[PDB]
PDB file of C-alpha atoms and ligand atoms in Angstrom:
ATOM      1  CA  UNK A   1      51.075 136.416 130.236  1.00  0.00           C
ATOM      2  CA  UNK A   2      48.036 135.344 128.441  1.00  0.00           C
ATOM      3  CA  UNK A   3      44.588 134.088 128.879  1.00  0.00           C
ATOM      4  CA  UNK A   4      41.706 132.448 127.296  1.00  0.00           C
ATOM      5  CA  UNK A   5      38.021 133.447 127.439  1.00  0.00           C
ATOM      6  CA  UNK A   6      35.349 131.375 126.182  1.00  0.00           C
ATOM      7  CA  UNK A   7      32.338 132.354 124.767  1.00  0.00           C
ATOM      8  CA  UNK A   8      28.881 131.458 125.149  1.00  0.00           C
ATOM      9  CA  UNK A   9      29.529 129.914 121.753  1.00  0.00           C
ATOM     10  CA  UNK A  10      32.442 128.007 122.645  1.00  0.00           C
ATOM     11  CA  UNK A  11      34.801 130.152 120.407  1.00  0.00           C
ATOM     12  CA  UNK A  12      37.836 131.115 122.030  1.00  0.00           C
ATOM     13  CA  UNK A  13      39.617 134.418 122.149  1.00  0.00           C
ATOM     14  CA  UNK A  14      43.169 134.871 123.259  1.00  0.00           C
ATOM     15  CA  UNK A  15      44.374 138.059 124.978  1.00  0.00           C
ATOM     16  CA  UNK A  16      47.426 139.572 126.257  1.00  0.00           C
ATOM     17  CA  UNK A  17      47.302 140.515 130.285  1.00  0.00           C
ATOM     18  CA  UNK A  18      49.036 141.301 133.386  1.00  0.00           C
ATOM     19  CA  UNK A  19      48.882 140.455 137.061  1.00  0.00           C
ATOM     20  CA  UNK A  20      47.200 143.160 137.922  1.00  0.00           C
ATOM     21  CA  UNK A  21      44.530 143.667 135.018  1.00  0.00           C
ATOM     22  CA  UNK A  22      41.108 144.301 135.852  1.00  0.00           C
ATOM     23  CA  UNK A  23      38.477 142.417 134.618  1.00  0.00           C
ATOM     24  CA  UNK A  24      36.891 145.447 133.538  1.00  0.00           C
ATOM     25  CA  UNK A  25      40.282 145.919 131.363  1.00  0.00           C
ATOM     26  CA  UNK A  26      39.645 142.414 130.476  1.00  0.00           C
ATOM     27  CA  UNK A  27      35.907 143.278 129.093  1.00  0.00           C
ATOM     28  CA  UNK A  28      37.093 146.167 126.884  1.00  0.00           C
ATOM     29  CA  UNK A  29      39.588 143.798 125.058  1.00  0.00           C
ATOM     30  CA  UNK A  30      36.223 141.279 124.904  1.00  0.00           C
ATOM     31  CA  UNK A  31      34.443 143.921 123.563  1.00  0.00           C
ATOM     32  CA  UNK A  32      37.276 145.181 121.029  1.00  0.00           C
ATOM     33  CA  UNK A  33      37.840 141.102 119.752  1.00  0.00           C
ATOM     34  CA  UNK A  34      33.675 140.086 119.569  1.00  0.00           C
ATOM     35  CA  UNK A  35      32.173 143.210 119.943  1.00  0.00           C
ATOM     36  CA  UNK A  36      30.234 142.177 123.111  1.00  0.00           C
ATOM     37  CA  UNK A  37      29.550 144.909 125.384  1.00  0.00           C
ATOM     38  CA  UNK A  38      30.895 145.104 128.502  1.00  0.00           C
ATOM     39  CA  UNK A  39      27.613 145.061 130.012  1.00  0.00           C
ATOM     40  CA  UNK A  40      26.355 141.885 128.350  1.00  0.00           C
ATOM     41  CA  UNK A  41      29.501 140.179 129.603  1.00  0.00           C
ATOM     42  CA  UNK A  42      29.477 137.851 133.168  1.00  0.00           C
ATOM     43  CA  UNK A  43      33.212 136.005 133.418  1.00  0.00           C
ATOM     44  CA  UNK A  44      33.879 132.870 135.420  1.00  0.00           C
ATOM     45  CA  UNK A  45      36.903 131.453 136.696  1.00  0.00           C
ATOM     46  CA  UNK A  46      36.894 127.903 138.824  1.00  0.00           C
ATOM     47  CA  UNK A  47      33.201 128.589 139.477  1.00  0.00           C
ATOM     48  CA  UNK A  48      34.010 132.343 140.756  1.00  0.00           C
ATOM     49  CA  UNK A  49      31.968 135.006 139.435  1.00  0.00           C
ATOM     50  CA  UNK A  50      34.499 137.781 138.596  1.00  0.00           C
ATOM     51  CA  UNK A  51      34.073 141.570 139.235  1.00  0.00           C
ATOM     52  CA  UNK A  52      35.323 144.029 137.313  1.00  0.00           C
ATOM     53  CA  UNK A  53      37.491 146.349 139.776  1.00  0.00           C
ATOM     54  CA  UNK A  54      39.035 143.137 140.854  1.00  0.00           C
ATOM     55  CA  UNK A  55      42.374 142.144 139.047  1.00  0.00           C
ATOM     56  CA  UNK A  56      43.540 138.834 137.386  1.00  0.00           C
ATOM     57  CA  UNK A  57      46.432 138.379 140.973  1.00  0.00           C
ATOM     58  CA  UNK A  58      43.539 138.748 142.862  1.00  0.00           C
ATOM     59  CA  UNK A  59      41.233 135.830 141.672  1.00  0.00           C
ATOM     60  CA  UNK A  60      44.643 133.558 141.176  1.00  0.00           C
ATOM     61  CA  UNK A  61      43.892 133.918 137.541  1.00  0.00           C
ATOM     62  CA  UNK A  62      47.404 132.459 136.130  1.00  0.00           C
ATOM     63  CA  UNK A  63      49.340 132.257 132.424  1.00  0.00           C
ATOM     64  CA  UNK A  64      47.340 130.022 130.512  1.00  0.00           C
ATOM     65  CA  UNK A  65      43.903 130.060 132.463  1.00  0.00           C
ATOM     66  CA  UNK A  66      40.301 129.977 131.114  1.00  0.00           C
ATOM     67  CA  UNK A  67      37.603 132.083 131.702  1.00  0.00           C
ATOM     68  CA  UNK A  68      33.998 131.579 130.706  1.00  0.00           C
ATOM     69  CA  UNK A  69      31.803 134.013 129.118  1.00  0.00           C
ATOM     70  CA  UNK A  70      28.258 132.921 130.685  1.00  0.00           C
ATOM     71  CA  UNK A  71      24.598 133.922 131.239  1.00  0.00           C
TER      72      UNK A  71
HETATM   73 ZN1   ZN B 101      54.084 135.523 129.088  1.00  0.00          ZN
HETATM   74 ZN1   ZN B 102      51.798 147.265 132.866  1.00  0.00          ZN
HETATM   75 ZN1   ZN B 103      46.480 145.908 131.038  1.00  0.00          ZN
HETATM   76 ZN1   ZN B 104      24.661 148.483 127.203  1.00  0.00          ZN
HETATM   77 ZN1   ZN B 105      35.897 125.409 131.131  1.00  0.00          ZN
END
């Protein structure tokens, strides 16, 4: 399973995941590729604003689906 996160720049970083990921497991590997802090980081997925204790299963976030980094 793997996803794609877009950053505000457009640049896109591919990670690893499963099912049940969080997103704030999701924002440490953000952090490790770009060294973005978890903090500074706001996801999207089909105009849903993600929260980290949530999981990837829960949001219907598939193999091969984009996030967005955003402001
Ligand atoms: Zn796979
Ligand atoms: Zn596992
Ligand atoms: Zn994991
Ligand atoms: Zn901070
Ligand atoms: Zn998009």
């Amino acid at each position: 399973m793997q996803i794609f996160v877009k950053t505000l720049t457009g640049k896109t970083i591919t990670l690893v995941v499963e099912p049940s990921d969080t997103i704030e497991n999701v924002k440490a590997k953000i952090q490790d590729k770009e060294g973005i802090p978890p903090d500074q980081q706001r996801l999207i997925f089909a105009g849903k604003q993600l929260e980290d204790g949530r999981t990837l299963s829960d949001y219907n976030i598939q193999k091969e689906s984009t996030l967005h980094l955003v402001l």
